[PDB]
Amino acid sequence: LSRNEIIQSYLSRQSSLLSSSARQPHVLLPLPTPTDLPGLTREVTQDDLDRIQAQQWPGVNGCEDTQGNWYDWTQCISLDPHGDDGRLNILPYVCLD
Amino acid sequence: MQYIKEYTDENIQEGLAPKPPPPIKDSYMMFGNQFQCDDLIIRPLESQGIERLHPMQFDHKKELRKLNMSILINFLDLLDILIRSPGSIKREEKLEDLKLLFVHVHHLINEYRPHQARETLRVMMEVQKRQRLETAERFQKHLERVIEMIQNCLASLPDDL
Amino acid sequence: RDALVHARLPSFAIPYAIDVLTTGSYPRLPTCIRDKIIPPDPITKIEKQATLHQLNQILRHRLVTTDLPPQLANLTVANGRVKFRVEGEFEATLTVMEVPWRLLKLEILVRALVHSMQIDFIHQLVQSRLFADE
Amino acid sequence: QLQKQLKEAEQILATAVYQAKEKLKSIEKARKGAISSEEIIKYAHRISASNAVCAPLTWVPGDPRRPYPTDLEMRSGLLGQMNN
Amino acid sequence: MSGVRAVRISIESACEKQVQEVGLDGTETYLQPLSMSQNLARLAQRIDFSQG
Amino acid sequence: MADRLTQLQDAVNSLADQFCNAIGVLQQCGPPASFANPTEEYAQLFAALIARTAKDIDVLIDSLPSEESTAALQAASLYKLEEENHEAATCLEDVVYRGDMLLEKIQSALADIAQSQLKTR
Amino acid sequence: DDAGNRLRFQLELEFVQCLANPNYLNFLAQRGYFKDKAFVNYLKYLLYWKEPEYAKYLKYPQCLHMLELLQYEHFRKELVNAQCAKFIDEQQILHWQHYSRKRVRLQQA
């Protein structure tokens, strides 16, 4: 934060893009009531999986959005969840790296 | 790529002269320089002992992002204050307190939370096998093609005239 | 800016447990170096017996796929080879290396005692006839 | 005609059975083979000192991450000086 | 977590992706198909008891 | 990555330093006055990347995993899933074995027929 | 018996895991480090020492690969080039985590 240049700015931008990452509608997935800890104190069953995979619930699979934005547990759909105009093949909802 | 004299002396033998086989360590041991520490701490406490970046809203990640934004705003305010009133000498002391927050930052944003979700994905792993079983179901459908071969048997009856 | 990443805590080292903990080799790695350095291993396992059974089945199929065995009215099903016939004159031999096969090498088995040991010219002509594949 | 039909059917069934056997061998290698939790925990506890088995941020295939702990600690360390 | 759980998961590894070209940011390619019929044919082509 | 180990403080400090450098290049040193394309492109790229990264981080934090997937719960779920996958694999293997036995019987009958046809000629 | 659990185990789990992998083994095998017959026999008789519990501070990894190179004469005579061995080790060590790098690269563009 003391000495900054064009190379330093490029390195900071690359580090930020590596660490943190026309409609671009962000699906504001709200805390689902069907969980396991402070949810319904129940184990993982077919009901919770079907509610998180078909309905808009970010329990296990993920809360699907409009415009065919199917966000399942391992669905790498080409959506536009980012803040840019690139609707490329985004990673899965889990994105386990 | 080296010559370990102890292991070579303990391994070079023909018959029962050699020592026991090299097994794995499931408990505390004194294997050379490595301490062989078992049960490494991974899950730390949030509100018990240090400051908690996760509110009671059950959203730890969103609360942590809000806390990071607030920390950035407070850093900007402290920089503006130092530019306006530079007589503060205890501000750096707060950085030491950040060390405590650094403990929480030890699980801040990068590469530790998804593993927990991977637990659920573990079940999905077997589901992936079920997907393969789905392809294996096609093999069962291949049995239906055997009936087609049975039709060839009928074709063996019609070709005889 | 620095101590958050340089002096942080790494992951559980899942990569080594996923790559090397399976077997003491380089499965999750490039096998090109070991192939260019070390040659293949002996494939004469029970897999070789399975391949021999598959070759025998392919030969049983080619027996009906090829011409009739009326040549000399004598033949046999050689396991992994081509046994021509019997009775010395049309003596069988070893002819080995879908995809129909062809006789590679022959052997004549019918005076002095030491008759002959070189089939060189005859073997070359047999190979030429096999490569003709008419 | 019956022999050709049976041969084609047997070839199809053999291809199906070969695919099934390959899938079964893959499933067996996936199920019977697993990683030890204690071993990974010990590797993480003993690897968090140097860059030996730790995954960096810009760690792609062929990146600066290597299997050795350090250059002086392995080539010129106890293996090169004490153990030669 | 801990890189492994105390359960029997089913995850098959694709070790066919032998690194042969130095690509950008890794991204290996699995090329070996491992066809059982093709593998048997290749094995019998060279290892079929040629001597006896 | 939807994980949380060591990126928050680093990303925040990097964004603060980038904003400070942008403000400096905009107000202190530059072709504003005297009392180019590369710097402007770098500043625009940095601002766009910071905005997109903040939006994506907020979205991933809202969509991150909840307190679910506990120890015993995940253990029991993985055990049940492994049992189900093993049962499915056993059924598929039995079906494949039946099919392979049928194919082997057909091949044996065909080989016997071919041997009889060759012996009859 | 008694001394084996404190001498062999102390020199086995920390022997064949991490340190002297093929990154710098091309220059260590051509000059001569374990090319001897007795050392090769000892390494072959002690090939079960590559446990993952101590996969960070070892003596010399890849015991089976070293045995195969010594059997096929691929360590002391062949593969003595440093560039090929270094590239192989670099593509072998950071390969199990290249999935995260590929995912980040795909999410970037």
Side-chain angles (χ1 to χ4, degrees), chain A residues 22 25 30 32 34 38-39 54 58-59 62 68 81 83 86 92, chain B residues 15 17-18 20-23 32 44 49 55 86-87 114 117 136 155 158, chain C residues 3 7 10 13 15 17 24 27 30 39-40 42 50 69-70 73 78 80 88 92 100-101 111-112 115-116 118-121 123-125 131-132, chain D residues 9 14 16 20 30 33-34 44 49 52 55-56 61-62 64 67 69 77 80, chain E residues 3 6 14 23 26 33 41 44 52, chain F residues 2 11 16 22 24 30-33 36 38 43 47-48 51 54 65 71-72 75-76 88-89 99 109 111 114, chain G residues 3-4 20 22 29 32 38 52 55 61 82 85 109:
Chain C
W101 205 252
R111 88 288 176 277
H115 156 257
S116 313
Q118 51 274 0
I119 203 72
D120 53 357
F121 189 75
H123 174 69
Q124 296 310 313
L125 264 297
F131 279 168

